[PDB]
Amino acid sequence: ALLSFERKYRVPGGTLVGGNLFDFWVGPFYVGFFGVATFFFAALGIILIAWSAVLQGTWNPQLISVYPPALEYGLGGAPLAKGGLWQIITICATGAFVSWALREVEICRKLGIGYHIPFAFAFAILAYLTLVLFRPVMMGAWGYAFPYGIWTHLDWVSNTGYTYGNFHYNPAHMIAHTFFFTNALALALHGALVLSAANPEKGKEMRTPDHEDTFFRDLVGYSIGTLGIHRLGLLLSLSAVFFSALCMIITGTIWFDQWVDWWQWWVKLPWWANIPGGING
Amino acid sequence: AEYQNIFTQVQVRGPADLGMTEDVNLANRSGVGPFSTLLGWFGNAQLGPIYLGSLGVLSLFSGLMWFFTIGIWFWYQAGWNPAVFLRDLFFFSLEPPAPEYGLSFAAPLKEGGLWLIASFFMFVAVWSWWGRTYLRAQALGMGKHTAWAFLSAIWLWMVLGFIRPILMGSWSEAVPYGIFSHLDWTNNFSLVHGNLHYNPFHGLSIAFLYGSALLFAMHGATILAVSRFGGERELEQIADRGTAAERAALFWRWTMGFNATMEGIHRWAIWMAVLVTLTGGIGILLSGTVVDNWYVWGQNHG
Amino acid sequence: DLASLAIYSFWIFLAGLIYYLQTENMREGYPLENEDGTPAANQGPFPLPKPKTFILPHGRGTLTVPGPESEDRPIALARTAVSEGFPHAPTGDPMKDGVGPASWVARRDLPELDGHGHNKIKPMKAAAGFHVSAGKNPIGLPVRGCDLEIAGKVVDIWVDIPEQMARFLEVELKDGSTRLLPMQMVKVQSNRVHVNALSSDLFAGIPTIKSPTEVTLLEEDKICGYVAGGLMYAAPKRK
Ligand code: BCL
Ligand code: BCL
Ligand SMILES: C/C=C1/c2cc3[nH]c4c(c3C)C(=O)[C@H](C(=O)OC)c4c3nc(cc4[nH]c(cc(n2)[C@@H]1C)c(C(C)=O)c4C)[C@@H](C)[C@@H]3CCC(=O)OC/C=C(\C)CCC[C@H](C)CCC[C@H](C)CCCC(C)C
Ligand SMILES: C/C=C1/c2cc3[nH]c4c(c3C)C(=O)[C@H](C(=O)OC)c4c3nc(cc4[nH]c(cc(n2)[C@@H]1C)c(C(C)=O)c4C)[C@@H](C)[C@@H]3CCC(=O)OC/C=C(\C)CCC[C@H](C)CCC[C@H](C)CCCC(C)C
Ligand SMILES: COC(C)(C)C(=O)C/C=C(\C)CC/C=C(\C)CC/C=C(\C)CCCC/C(C)=C/CC[C@H](C)CC/C=C(\C)CCC=C(C)C
Ligand SMILES: CCCCCCCCCCCC[N+](C)(C)[O-]
Ligand SMILES: CCCCCCCCCCCC[N+](C)(C)[O-]
Ligand SMILES: CCCCCCCCCCCC[N+](C)(C)[O-]
Ligand SMILES: CCCCCCCCCCCC[N+](C)(C)[O-]
Ligand SMILES: CCCCCCCCCCCC[N+](C)(C)[O-]
Ligand SMILES: CCCCCCCCCCCC[N+](C)(C)[O-]
Ligand SMILES: [Cl-]
Ligand SMILES: [Fe+3]
Ligand SMILES: [K+]
Ligand SMILES: [K+]
């Protein structure tokens, strides 16, 4: 089926591969070549996960886990039952994500809009590839990557972090955390601002962006504007993920001690290292 | 290549915009500040005006009182030596009363009496500021969504510093005012309760937190992608849908099989974000009051 | 156990909320339709919400959604297949007909008003006190199309007065008439403005506006639609 206004936009064209061959929909879903790619990769990966489940011996979402090859295997293959499945599933997953983004590009071209959405998605994809590919390879083993299971990958976050003490002290992770929390704050405000203007007091008229600017200036003395708030939400979000990937790309590679000790470079600065008093004197 | 609308190419300025008046007491509105051309490359260049009624000055005053009360204690921890004050800036901490003093206000000032003082100023400043978010919307005839969302963040903060200390019987449970010290508080809170990763409300908080970065990435990218049809003029696209709103909806429908409206997306947005601190506050509130170990609880309840 | 009760309750509340949010997002484009315009059999598992009504300011009326839904325009497309789900070929010139990436919506043929009832968007010449304040001022620059030929010259900027931003460049063509180009679709360079969406020969076909000092929502959608459609539709013949 189609929305009221949809048919005028369902024209040929936009594809990057295959010409008219996969230029069609399935219900609401656009296909394209990269829809087929996504389906193949995703279906393969899911099948392998269900297979890796019988080798483990459980069909329970909260127990199915697919661990990478152990550190003994370095950066080479491993028997399927012992981390080859994880490796090929990782290839499927990279395959499906990259396909999904390229499928979004084709939708972008058919609709005459900018490419901002798959570009933004590519930041998430690179965070994933940091954990499963870039950092493992820089560290010499696939075993440093996280397992694919609901609770076991949480255990991996905890064990990886505590390997460096309290992980809060990773300074890139400190910046990332700030962008995540700022982003949520911006999201709550933006959503509440537009809705407070579109849904004013009972019986009143629908307010204007002018009211939206006025409201925030009244409140904080500034208003970023309706174009700016969308620039902002995108920038906070992608920066959060960038500094996420950055905080882990540097951990276990250029820095591998307790992150709390990294901060001693500040306190042991010559002009104040040895003054008495304070917490470190 | 194509222009991406991330940064303005040509700024234009006109007379300083003093804003809608509606029912606002204009006597309490300042005059406009300067114009930041720097800001103008990303958002608005105009600073000010700001409204500052009595509730306004109250909030602002107790906020700095909270802040100076901490910084006073930080100087004394530095023995008034400016060089150590900077050197140890992230290590100073204004700690709450020890468990001995319970919920009382009897503790000496250098043993949590000062914490309670700064906390009082914080309490006053936040709650008055909350009233400001309601009142400034009322004066303009707008909905109360902003104050309602703000309440959700206030929820967690209230739980961390007030409701949960009270339910646990002592101020010692509350968060200390300090950079590194409250990070440590966070880590030790998790260890003491058997790993918050097993708190189901903590997991939900993360899903909404991650989700907010997902949704605002999606949303912000979508509006930029259709800003070549005026997409960011959202209120008028709500009142009279344009090709911008239709291409936006259809991108997502074609991608994931369903889509939003120009208004509805903002309801997804406000809820994604406010559920972060809503589930968050619940999960903290339950910790040590009802559940002492989230691993243990997880063994019996799922 | 209280925590078990709280989390079970929350999952129920979260399902009601998602249901609520999904229905709220069906106030446009629903009911679903077949490609021929009739109601589709399968509408999904979510019902239409009870209508709501927005009170527009400045006597502009109201909007009630969901409501009866019509494109309120002819659509020059035809099926390319004998079953559902394939593309629909333009029966004419797709940029002239306003289909595909060249599509426009029959928005109200009035201009958008600010909070004081005045037109949101004015050419800068008619905007008291408005001037270029940073970046290269485009007024006077030649405008170059994607075929690398000059199609015109910038003669003003059309500015959003309440938000104080540039929204269109007004470009004058060889014949002395002007067009509006969306600001978001030009690249202001030091010696020119570059428009990659249109070749020089398609500039004359940009929809024109009826009054030289305002632009209506309907006119903006035709201009924006047309220019954006050039990305797919100019690319063959020129680049
Ligand atoms: C991001 C930094 C860390 C990490 C740290 C944490 C922590 C800490 C927590 C989670 C939590 C979750 N994480 Mg994790 N997580 C990582 C990487 C991933 C990846 C990935 C491929 O890169 C995926 C798919 C997930 C998925 C998940 C969900 C099971 C859950 C809620 C996420 C959410 O709402 O996100 C925002 C996104 C949305 C709202 C959109 C919808 C996303 C849906 C829910 C994802 C479903 C995944 C599905 C179960 C996977 C199998 C797919 C099928 C095989 C096809 N994580 C890395 C290693 N993640 C939480 C939890 O409760 O876990 C038990 C939690 O507390
Ligand atoms: C070792 C650390 C522990 C752990 C311990 C805790 C503890 C303890 C808590 C969290 C909390 C949170 N954690 Mg955890 N957390 C861990 C692992 C993680 C991981 C991960 C990758 O594994 C992630 C992604 C998270 C993420 C999160 C968030 C979802 C959540 C906070 C919501 C929020 O925004 O609060 C921030 C928002 C607020 C505090 C509200 C602020 C509102 C007030 C009103 C603002 C006042 C401003 C003031 C006046 C100053 C003004 C200055 C201005 C400039 C003027 N945690 C591990 C297992 N985490 C919190 C939570 O909710 O848990 C359920 C919490 O308390
Ligand atoms: C960069 C800023 C943010 C950002 C941004 C954006 N995010 C986007 C877009 C943008 C802009 C899109 O355009 C796109 C989309 O359409 O949205 C609706 C997308 C999407 N973001 C998803 C998940 C998501 N985003 C997260 C984070 C952020 N996103 C950050 C914060 C997180 C976490 C953990 O935080 C999650 C879980 C999907 C919903 C969706 C891809 C679907 C897909 O690619 O389908 C194609 C693939 C499949 C249908 C399944 C493939 C199955 C494999 C082969 C088998 C499984 C392998 C796997 C490794 C197993 C893991 C188990 C688990 C327990 C560990
Ligand atoms: C999920 C829900 C999200 C969310 C939601 C919402 N959050 C809101 C609203 C909503 C909806 C509002 O409506 C309201 C507001 O109006 O927004 C513009 C507000 C707010 N959320 C603030 C901070 C915050 N939210 C956080 C969290 C989330 N919130 C989560 C993620 C976090 C953390 C830790 O994560 C923080 C730090 C303030 C900006 C503001 C309160 C001001 C106050 O109560 O002031 C009272 C204090 C004062 C008036 C003065 C205090 C003096 C200061 C220290 C200044 C000294 C300056 C010095 C001289 C110079 C240098 C500066 C240097 C120190 C830097
Ligand atoms: C240059 O130096 C000068 C002196 C000028 C300065 O002023 C420098 C200032 C500083 C250096 C200040 C630095 C400030 C910080 C480092 C702030 C750090 C604070 C945090 C990290 C906050 C963590 C979370 C805080 C929380 C959760 C607070 C909760 C507060 C409660 C909800 C309040 C409840 C009230 C109480 C308990 C008091 C009793 C209640 C009544 C109602 C009476
Ligand atoms: C992982 C994909 C990232 C999204 C990329 C966004 C910009 C892509 C531009 C595509 C143009 C392709 N081409 C060569 C046909 O023009
Ligand atoms: C969150 C960003 C806050 C920006 C604050 C801007 C302060 C308001 C400026 C008021 C100017 C008053 N004065 C003296 C110039 O007239
Ligand atoms: C309003 C958007 C709704 C987003 C849906 C969030 C999915 C939650 C999955 C996280 C699971 C958390 N838990 C309790 C199992 O730990
Ligand atoms: C949080 C769990 C993620 C589940 C993904 C849900 C995607 C639903 C897409 C539904 C659209 C398909 N259809 C035919 C029903 O329209
Ligand atoms: C969601 C409600 C949270 C609190 C419910 C009642 C518990 C109050 C605290 C009592 C128990 C605390 N303590 C110290 C005995 O563990
Ligand atoms: C965490 C996000 C939850 C997404 C919820 C899934 C919604 C899919 C149903 C959309 C209905 C599409 N339909 C049939 C009405 O067109
Ligand atoms: Cl809502
Ligand atoms: Fe928006
Ligand atoms: K315990
Ligand atoms: K002028």
Numbering used by the authors:
A (entry chain L): 1 to 281
B (entry chain M): 1 to 302
C (entry chain H): 11 to 249
Give sentences copied directly from the paper behind this entry.
We have combined I(L177)H and F(M197)H mutations in C. sphaeroides RC to increase the stability of its structure and thereby increase the probability of obtaining the crystal structure of this complex with higher resolution. The crystal structure of the double mutant reaction center was obtained with a resolution of 2.6 Å and an estimated maximal coordinate error of 0.31 Å. The structure shows that the water is located at a distance of 2.7 Å from the central Mg2+ atom of BB, which is typical for the BChl axial ligands. This water is also 3.1 Å close to the imidazole group of His-L177, which is within the typical range for H-bond formation. The imidazole group of His-L177 points towards the methyl carbon of the pyrrole ring I of PA with the center-to-center distance between N and C atoms of 2.06 Å. According to the electron density map, imidazole forms a covalent bond with the methyl carbon of PA with a high degree of probability. In both complexes, the imidazole group of His-M197 is located within the H-bond distance from the C2-acetyl carbonyl group of BChl PB. Taking into account the coordinate error, it suggests that no H-bond forms between these groups in RC I(L177)H + F(M197)H. The absence of this H-bond is consistent with some shortening of the distance between water-C and the imidazole group of His-M197 (2.7 Å), compared with the structure of RC F(M197)H (3.1 Å). We assume that this can explain why the value of Em P/P+ in double mutant RC is ~20 mV lower than the sum of changes in the mid-point potentials caused by each of the two mutations.
